[PDB]
Amino acid sequence: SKVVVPAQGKKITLQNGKLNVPENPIIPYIEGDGIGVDVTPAMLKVVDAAVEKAYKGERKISWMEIYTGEKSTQVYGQDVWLPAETLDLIREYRVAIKGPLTTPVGGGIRSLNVALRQELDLYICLRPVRYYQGTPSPVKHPELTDMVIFRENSEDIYAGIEWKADSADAEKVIKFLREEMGVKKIRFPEHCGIGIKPCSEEGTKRLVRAAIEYAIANDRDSVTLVHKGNIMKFTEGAFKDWGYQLAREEFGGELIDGGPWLKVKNPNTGKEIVIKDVIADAFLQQILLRPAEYDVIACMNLNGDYISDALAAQVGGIGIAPGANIGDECALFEATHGTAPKYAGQDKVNPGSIILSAEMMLRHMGWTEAADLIVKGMEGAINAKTVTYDFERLMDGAKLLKCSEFGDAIIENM
Amino acid sequence: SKVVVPAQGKKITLQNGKLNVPENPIIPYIEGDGIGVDVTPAMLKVVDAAVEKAYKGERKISWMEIYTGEKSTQVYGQDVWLPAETLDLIREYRVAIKGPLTTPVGGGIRSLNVALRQELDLYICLRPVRYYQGTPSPVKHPELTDMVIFRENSEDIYAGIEWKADSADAEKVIKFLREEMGVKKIRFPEHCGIGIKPCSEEGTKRLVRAAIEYAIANDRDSVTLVHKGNIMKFTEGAFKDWGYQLAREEFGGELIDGGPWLKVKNPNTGKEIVIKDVIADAFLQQILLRPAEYDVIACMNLNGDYISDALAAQVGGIGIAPGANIGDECALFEATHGTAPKYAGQDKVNPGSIILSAEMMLRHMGWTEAADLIVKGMEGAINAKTVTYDFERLMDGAKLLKCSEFGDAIIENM
Ligand SMILES: [Mg+2]
Ligand SMILES: [Mg+2]
Numbered sequence: 001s002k003v004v005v006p007a008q009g010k011k012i013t014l015q016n017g018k019l020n021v022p023e024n025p026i027i028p029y030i031e032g033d034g035i036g037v038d039v040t041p042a043m044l045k046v047v048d049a050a051v052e053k054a055y056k057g058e059r060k061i062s063w064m065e066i067y068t069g070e071k072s073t074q075v076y077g078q079d080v081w082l083p084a085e086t087l088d089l090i091r092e093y094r095v096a097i098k099g100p101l102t103t104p105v106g107g108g109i110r111s112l113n114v115a116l117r118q119e120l121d122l123y124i125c126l127r128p129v130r131y132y133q134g135t136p137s138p139v140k141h142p143e144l145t146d147m148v149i150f151r152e153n154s155e156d157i158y159a160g161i162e163w164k165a166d167s168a169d170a171e172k173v174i175k176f177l178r179e180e181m182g183v184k185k186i187r188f189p190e191h192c193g194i195g196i197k198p199c200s201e202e203g204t205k206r207l208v209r210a211a212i213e214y215a216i217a218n219d220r221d222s223v224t225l226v227h228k229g230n231i232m233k234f235t236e237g238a239f240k241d242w243g244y245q246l247a248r249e250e251f252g253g254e255l256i257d258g259g260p261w262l263k264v265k266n267p268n269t270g271k272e273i274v275i276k277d278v279i280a281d282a283f284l285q286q287i288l289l290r291p292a293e294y295d296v297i298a299c300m301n302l303n304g305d306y307i308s309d310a311l312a313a314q315v316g317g318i319g320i321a322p323g324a325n326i327g328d329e330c331a332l333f334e335a336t337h338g339t340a341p342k343y344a345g346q347d348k349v350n351p352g353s354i355i356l357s358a359e360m361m362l363r364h365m366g367w368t369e370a371a372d373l374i375v376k377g378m379e380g381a382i383n384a385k386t387v388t389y390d391f392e393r394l395m396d397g398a399k400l401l402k403c404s405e406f407g408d409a410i411i412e413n414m
Numbered sequence: 415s416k417v418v419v420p421a422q423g424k425k426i427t428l429q430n431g432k433l434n435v436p437e438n439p440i441i442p443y444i445e446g447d448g449i450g451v452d453v454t455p456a457m458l459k460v461v462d463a464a465v466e467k468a469y470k471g472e473r474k475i476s477w478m479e480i481y482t483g484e485k486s487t488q489v490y491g492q493d494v495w496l497p498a499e500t501l502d503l504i505r506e507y508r509v510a511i512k513g514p515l516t517t518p519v520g521g522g523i524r525s526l527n528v529a530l531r532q533e534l535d536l537y538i539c540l541r542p543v544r545y546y547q548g549t550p551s552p553v554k555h556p557e558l559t560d561m562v563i564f565r566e567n568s569e570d571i572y573a574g575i576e577w578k579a580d581s582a583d584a585e586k587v588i589k590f591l592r593e594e595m596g597v598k599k600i601r602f603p604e605h606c607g608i609g610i611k612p613c614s615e616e617g618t619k620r621l622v623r624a625a626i627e628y629a630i631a632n633d634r635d636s637v638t639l640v641h642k643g644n645i646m647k648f649t650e651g652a653f654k655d656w657g658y659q660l661a662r663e664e665f666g667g668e669l670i671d672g673g674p675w676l677k678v679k680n681p682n683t684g685k686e687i688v689i690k691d692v693i694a695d696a697f698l699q700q701i702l703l704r705p706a707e708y709d710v711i712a713c714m715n716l717n718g719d720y721i722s723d724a725l726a727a728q729v730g731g732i733g734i735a736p737g738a739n740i741g742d743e744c745a746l747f748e749a750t751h752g753t754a755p756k757y758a759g760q761d762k763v764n765p766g767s768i769i770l771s772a773e774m775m776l777r778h779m780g781w782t783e784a785a786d787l788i789v790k791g792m793e794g795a796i797n798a799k800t801v802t803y804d805f806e807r808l809m810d811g812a813k814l815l816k817c818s819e820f821g822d823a824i825i826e827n828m
Contacts, residue, residue: 110645114645139553139554154601155601170648181586187535197571197609199606200602233576234608238607285732288552289552313702
């Protein structure tokens with residue numbers, strides 16, 4: 001009702017699990033608050049250059065702007081941070097990409113990013129992190145990191161079931177716990193905030209299955225379930241058990257003997273995928289100390305949030321880190337950094353994150369060539385040391401380009 | 415009743431907040447399971463060498479072995495993993511040190527380490543991590559890390575209030591939530607584990623106060639409250655607000671202007687301590703990318719568990735990392751690594767963790783000189799490249815010593 005759906009262009013279609021993508025598909029994009037205003041123009045430009053190059057004119061993307069966050073209040077009015085038609089439109093057109101999003105404080109409004117993920121039941125947050133040769137890194141051997149994070153997006157403490165200290169609600173559920181559940185374990189039951197952490201069997205088996213399938217499909221070497229289950233037995237310890245169980249029941253997992261690790265034969269390559277677990281505090285060490293030991297990572301919502309950020313810092317890509325939130329009916333590719341308001345409009349930040357998320361998008365649509373061209377362009381530009389301010393600070397010999405210009409540098413190395 | 419309390423030796427005493435340590439104090443030690451059997455002998459030897467050297471014969475520690483974990487079942491019988499007199503004895507004698515501890519699975523027995531912390535209300539888990547010059551590190555500039563973690567030990571998800579998926583209990587509290595609290599937010603309420611995360615005002619103000627006091631007392635530059643409060647408003651977002659509030663109300667915190675950061679003047683040095691917060695996923699990046707920006711860290715129980723391990727890996731000290739659990743009435747210094755059963759009895763693991771925890775112990779007792787001698791000995795031995803297998807693997811030029819021998823190498827460099 002304020003979106004102008006393109007005259008030329010045809011919806012992607014979901015024909016029983018598989019995506020039927022037209023040659024002129026309408027992809028919705030949410031511009032993004034803050035630096036979205038800079039990074040997004042850079043991505044439409046390089047995706048367009050990459051599908052024109054790959055398919056020689058045959059295919060073209062019809063971009064359709066939809067609204068969430070701060071720009072939505074300037075379009076639908078002050079109170080609408082998340083319009084109900086953005087949810088219908090993403091659902092409808094099947095794949096979408098977005099830039100960074102401002103959630104307001106003071107309004108009782110929960111994270112708009114998390115909101116899109118729960119509202120549209122996009123239960124897979126998939127964050128790939130690998131090293132691009134030549135980016136500055138804090139660590140000695142970032143080239144050893146090449147991991148894929150499958151982070152659960154629909155349950156854990158992120159469900160947002162919590163009550164204020166001294167509220168009536170909080171007073172009521174603490175009474176139920178102490179009186180009716182007989183809990184003698186809250187150190188200070190007075191002035192006490194309360195949060196609920198749910199972890200169900202369906203929620204974790206659907207994420208673990210996506211994780212192992214991804215491993216089979218790209219014949220990755222292993223799947224590590226990380227958790228803190230020695231302390232949280234019935235939510236995080238349930239997650240490692242339900243994941244070993246699904247590997248044994250649905251993928252023919254077998255002990256590498258003695259336990260606990262499982263072998264899964266990839267039906268396609270003949271290779272074995274090891275299915276293992278590491279406790280989450282030790283994991284944060286093991287990714288710094290032995291990165292080559294790890295590959296596909298399956299984990300619950302809070303832990304995957306931390307593991308992503310941490311893995312991203314080490315390979316030197318906190319501003320060129322892509323991501324996706326995938327469910328059964330649709331997907332939303334996103335820049336994974338924030339809105340950086342101090343730089344907005346200055347054309348200077350790194351468009352690399354939202355760009356590499358459009359190669360994930362292009363890849364997901366089956367436009368694999370367009371997509372391989374974007375990562376070709378990326379390695380080209382970085383290796384050219386034809387880089388944006390964030391990378392240049394840390395490099396000797398680089399040429400500083402603006403945001404729009406690193407767009408063009410990616411197109412030149414295609 | 416199986417402990418043999420020393421003939422010579424006198425209890426430490428708590429005379430209103432301050433510790434009155436005799437010259438021949440009885441310190442209880444829990445040997446430790448697994449490699450405790452190796453690392454502990456090494457620490458009694460070097461602490462003894464360091465108090466003999468410093469005080470020239472005047473002072474001597476009377477060691478008193480007490481039991482927890484696997485060795486306790488071999489002393490009190492199969493069922494007693496944690497004897498009730500270990501809690502009375504630590505309480506009584508005021509300071510104690512322990513080695514790594516085996517908690518059994520299959521028995522419904524929760525973490526024995528966490529058990530000591532909650533049972534004796536040791537609400538401060540204090541983990542200092544700084545770089546010792548010459549230890550092998552995964553990162554380029556570990557010398558930039560010098561941080562002190564104040565991790566809350568008595569509440570958060572670690573309280574252990576949780577119920578099994580499909581249990582009656584779990585079925586009952588999910589019914590209360592959906593029916594009586596009106597929660598329409600559990601994606602899958604069937605087959606669902608449930609955990610409780612409590613965060614009270616007293617629990618966080620006592621930990622934040624210890625954190626800022628430590629900053630004043632050693633005039634450290636800042637205190638960073640880390641949290642994930644944008645998603646968890648009433649437990650983790652309550653923690654950053656209660657911590658800013660205590661800085662303003664009890665330490666005369668003032669805005670560095672515009673907010674949110676506070677200045678606290680150190681009453682002793684005249685210097686200002688900045689009181690700031692960073693969201694926990696960004697923090698895990700900022701400790702890799704800008705370590706010099708951070709110093710004293712205050713945070714809740716799960717986050718501090720992860721932050722410690724992560725910071726410890728980077729400076730290359732996952733086996734030489736000390737710690738303490740401190741409450742108002744007593745303290746327990748501990749090796750912070752595990753029991754490593756494959757190496758037990760081989761005299762080969764690094765005794766550096768439990769040793770550096772005894773310098774924290776010695777320091778806490780006011781035997782500051784003994785203590786400065788242990789860290790002198792540590793920098794000496796490591797710099798000598800007279801090192802244990804874990805360090806030698808990663809170094810070119812080192813001499814490999816056994817565990818007992820790196821004990822002696824620390825004594826030689828005193
Ligand atoms: Mg995050
Ligand atoms: Mg830990």
